Amino acid sequence: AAVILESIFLKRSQQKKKTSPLNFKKCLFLLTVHKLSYYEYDFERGRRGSKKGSIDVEKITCVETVVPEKNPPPERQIPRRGEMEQISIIERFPYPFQVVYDEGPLYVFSPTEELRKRWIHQLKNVIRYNSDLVQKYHPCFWIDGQYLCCSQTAKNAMGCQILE
């Protein structure tokens, strides 16, 4: 239906092999009451490009922040505390969140804490009446075949931490 939120975020790739390197791609994300979808962004024409994927909101089980990477590259470094800066808002993406569904977690990186908060609040609103909402989550990333939080080697492993 109507677009609730539209933003440019980094999306982390779904790791095929535990030894394989991770890719972070800049995409346009759209949220409606029915779907969360992501697209290539056509910078030159200033519009969304081809659709890369879509998740029916009814399939989402959890939306929360993720503990940040311990040694991120400059593109994902958190700035020191304290009017929108045009360059940084499309170049730096330090604030990650996770959208958990049928196929496991999707990791998305926001340029600001405020924008991450807006997306987590709205996603929690659209999923509020879902039937498979979980009570537990993984506070840390699934990286190189295991969760950094609990060392579990299954992506579908029940969250190690109870949601507050």
Ligand SMILES: CN1C(=O)C(=O)c2ccccc21
């Ligand atoms: C679909 N897809 C891929 O195939 C890939 O390598 C990647 C990296 C980030 C986000 C999405 C991706």
Ligand SMILES: [Mg+2]
């Ligand atoms: Mg536009």
Ligand SMILES: [Zn+2]
């Ligand atoms: Zn865990």
